[PDB]
Structures are given as C-alpha cells and as structure tokens.
Amino acid sequence: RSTLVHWFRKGLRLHDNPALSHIFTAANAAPGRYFVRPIFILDPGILDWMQVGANRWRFLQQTLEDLDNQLRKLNSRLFVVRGKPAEVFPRIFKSWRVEMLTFETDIEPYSVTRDAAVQKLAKAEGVRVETHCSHTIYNPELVIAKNLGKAPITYQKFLGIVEQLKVPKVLGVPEKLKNMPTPPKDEVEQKDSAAYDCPTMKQLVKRPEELGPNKFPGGETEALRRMEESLKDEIWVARFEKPNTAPNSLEPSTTVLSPYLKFGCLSARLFNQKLKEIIKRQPKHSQPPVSLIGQLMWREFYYTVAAAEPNFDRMLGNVYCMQIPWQEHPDHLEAWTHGRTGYPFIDAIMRQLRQEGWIHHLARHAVACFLTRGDLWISWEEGQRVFEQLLLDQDWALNAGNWMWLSASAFFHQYFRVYSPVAFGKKTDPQGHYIRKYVPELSKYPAGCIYEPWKASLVDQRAYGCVLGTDYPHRIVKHEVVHKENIKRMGAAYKVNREV
Ligand SMILES: Cc1cc2nc3c(=O)[nH]c(=O)nc-3n(C[C@H](O)[C@H](O)[C@H](O)COP(=O)(O)OP(=O)(O)OC[C@H]3O[C@@H](n4cnc5c(N)ncnc54)[C@H](O)[C@@H]3O)c2cc1C
C-alpha cells in the first residue's frame, strides 16, 4: 500500500483546491490501495528568508488547527512535519512509499527553488508530481505568454490581457474518504505519537508579549464566514470604490480578507466568482480599478510582474525599479518603525499595525510615503521588512509591488504628489478618533490640534497631560521642509535613471 501526499504551503483550504481534490478522488476511486497524507512542513529555512511577527505566527497556528479540524471531517487529518523539505521528502518518500505528490504552485523565488529540488527528488524516486495554479485566478506564466514574454507593467494593459483568458472552474470541497484506515506509524511517529500534531500556540509564538488583540482569527472557516459577512450588503459590494474608503475609521472600511487570501484560507477564484454573481445582480456597480473585483485584479497584476523578476523585493538588480540613492538614518527608521515620529497620524497607523497586524490600504500609503519619497528618504526595502514582520497579510509580491508604487520606484511616477502627515487623515476623521484610540497619550487634545500637537501652547500641553518631548515625541522632521527637498532629490534620481 502506497501513499498519496498533498503538500500544503499556501492554499490552506479544503475548498477550490484542485491539488488536494485530486488526491482525495484518487483514494476513493481506488479504495484499499492508497494511504493519504495531507502535510504541512514547518520549514526552518523560511526564517532565514523572511521575518514573522507574533501576530502572524498566531494566525498561522489558528489556520493549521482549522485545517486539521476540516480534514478530520473528511476522515483524514493534517500531518505537520518539522524539518527542511530537502531533508524531509527523501525520508517520507520511502517510509511512506509515496506514489503521487500534489501541491499548489507559487511564484516566490524561495518557493520556485524549493519546488524545483523537490521535483528533482520526486523524479529520482519515481514519484508522480501534479501541480496546480490555484493561488491566483490567472496563471502569470500564461499572462506573460499572451503579452509576448513580458509582464504588462500597467494595470490597464494587464486587464486587457486577462479579459481574453479563460476563468478557471471553481471546485468545491473534496468528498469524504471512503473506508480509509489511519496510515501506519513511521519511524518518527513511533517514538512520538504527537510528532506530526498541529503546533500549539506555545510552540510557534515565542514572543507572546507581542501578540495584540485577537481580531482576525486564522482558518478557512473564518475566511469563509468573513467573506459571506462582507457579501451580505450587495449594495456596498456592488458600489465599492476603494479610493473612497476611509483609512482611519475605527472599524475597517474594507473587507480585511487579505490575511485569508495570503495564506490561501480563501480561494481568490471563489471570491472572484461570488463577486461576479453580485455584480450581475446589481446593474449600478463600480468597475476596475476601484471596484472590489478591481482589487482582486490588483493582486493578480502584482503577482504577474513579480513572477518575472526574482529580485522583485529589492532595488538592486530589479528590472522594474528606479535606482534611487536612499539614505541611511537608523534613528529615523527606528522612530517610524515604532510609531514615534511625532506625527500623530503616522504614529497611530504604525501602532495599529504593530498591535493588530492590519491597516487600511491608504493608511499603508500614508506611512510608506512618509518613510520613503515623502519625508525620511529611507529605502522602501526597510519599510517592506517592517511590513513583512508586522502584517497578517504579508505577501512577497504585494508588499514589494506596493512599496515600489508608493516610493515612485515603479508603476507610479507622479512623485510631486505627496501625502501630508497632518492633513491626509483629517478628511475622513476630523475629530481624530483614530489617533485618540492608537495614540491615547494625546486623547485630551481637541480636534483643532490633535493632528498637530505642537500648535498647542506648553500650558495647554500640561493641561492635556501630554507634554511634547516627554510624554509624546517631538517631530523627527519638519514635513514642510523635507518633502520639498525630497521632491528635488526624486527629480535628480529620475534624470539619472533616464540617461542610463
Ligand atoms: C506599502 C504597501 C504594502 C502592502 N502590502 C501588502 C501585503 O503585504 N499584502 C497584501 O495582501 N496587500 C498589501 N498591500 C495592498 C493593500 O494595502 C492590502 O491588500 C489591503 O489593505 C488589504 O485590505 P482588504 O483586505 O480590506 O482589501 P480590499 O479593499 O477588501 O481588497 C480585497 C483584496 O484585494 C487585494 N488587494 C486590495 N488592494 C490591493 C492592492 N493595492 N494591491 C494588491 N492587492 C490588493 C487583496 O487580496 C485584498 O485582500 C500593500 C499596499 C501598500 C501601499
């Protein structure tokens, strides 16, 4: 008796999962011949390649527990294997007598390298490998091909390409396993009956004092619930216009399905299909790029450009990216990282990010502009690394692609438009409720200067219980000075890149 193995990496869901579906149907169409090991590998190597904060560790822990729970309802379970794939797969290929291995493809360079070696091993031991592109709606390879070998570098050209492509069939959950015995314990399982159990919170989250509020629980189950909750107001959905959603409402102004889409707890193909059903129903609706389907197409767009550039997450060696002489300033980077810039709107956002792991798109705009071309003139690579640690939805292609946009390094070139750290939040939160919540030490400043506490006299600062420089920091830079200097630095950068 040989084993069929589905390998979870992303695609942490039962629904719309062709690679996992196939394994299951094969076991049921040939009962008695197969064991089934759905596995997730706790790869220590990924830590040398990306930062993971406490909040995202908890989201992953919750996700694996849910996935194990969902698999048990199918007379299976999740087998979480600790170790490096390059060392894990040669062992289990033999100890399990693996016939077929399926997984969902991923375009990240670490994923490509790792998968190539696993496919070299699988070819050596005579193991059949079947891969499926189900993490995105469109296959970046096919988009690039249809555009004659280059990724479209504008959103509109990208849309024109994928409109001519076939939308995939969205699958349901696999059928329950018919008369399947629990596989026999292997070398590892026998010395430890729990060697493959889902990891507890205590095993994955080493810095539990950095956990914030538990607001967006991991798991396919929670992802499906949150999608359904979001789709209930078909009018909000159909008339959604991303630029008009607020960055600083106390409740999120968008869906917050991003962590679920990042891990594959929600199939983007399923989400796309549910959106298209509502739009069909609702003749007055928005269109890309501002619509909700337009937001899914932003995700596809960045995945497509990223798939063609292994150096997508850095400035050097990146075919898309303007070469800009970003400066080093550790103290400023530390202030921005910990929301101690002295600009309450910026600080409020960075503290929400650290505590909760999610901030609104335009809140990302505000803090990214401030760090890079706007104010601090610090490389977008540094902001990307901080976002990578703190975000639940940390996504190699999205995190990089949007930082390049926000810094005027690629895709976006109107660097003369600069967000004010004082004025931008006022449009949607003139009372400063957001600042009061995440910068509580300012909670007694009136609206007239909560965005600019340095315009309150010392007497008033003592009256509000928050003296600048003691209880809340002074501005680390003067926006009105540096943003004009940085515009000229950008123009000089753009001239140098144009001549080369
Ligand atoms: C500096 C910066 C860094 C970012 N880093 C990430 C990241 O690490 N991970 C991430 O998923 N998104 C990232 N984004 C894009 C965007 O901010 C988030 O996708 C969005 O805030 C998620 O909230 P939501 O789920 O409510 O989005 P909604 O408005 O509800 O959109 C639904 C889905 O569409 C996609 N989407 C929406 N906006 C964008 C966008 N601009 N680009 C690409 N896909 C988009 C996401 O899958 C999202 O879950 C970043 C943007 C900026 C400016």
Automatic annotation (TrEMBL):
Cofactor: FAD
SUPFAM superfamilies named among the record's database cross-references: Cryptochrome/photolyase FAD-binding domain, Cryptochrome/photolyase, N-terminal domain
Gene3D superfamilies registered for this protein in UniProt: 1.25.40.80, DNA Cyclobutane Dipyrimidine Photolyase, subunit A, domain 3, HUPs
Pfam families cross-referenced by the UniProt entry: DNA_photolyase, FAD_binding_7
Site, as annotated: Electron transfer via tryptophanyl radical: W326, W380, W403
Positions that bind FAD: 242, 254-258, 295-302, 358, 361, 364, 393-395, 402
GO biological process: response to light stimulus
GO MF terms, alphabetically ordered: nucleotide binding
PROSITE patterns, per the entry: PHR_CRY_ALPHA_BETA
Positions of the Photolyase/cryptochrome alpha/beta domain: 2-137
Cofactor stoichiometry and binding remark: Binds 1 FAD per subunit.
Keywords, sorted A to Z: FAD, Flavoprotein, Nucleotide-binding
InterPro entries in the record: Crypto/Photolyase_FAD-like_sf, Crypto/Photolyase_N_sf, Cryptochr/Photolyase_FAD-bd, Cryptochrome/DNA_photolyase_1, DNA_photolyase_N, Rossmann-like_a/b/a_fold
UniProt xrefs under PANTHER family: CRYPTOCHROME, CRYPTOCHROME CIRCADIAN CLOCK 5 ISOFORM X1
Family: Belongs to the DNA photolyase class-1 family.
Name by which UniProt lists this protein: RE11660p
This protein's encoding gene: phr6-4
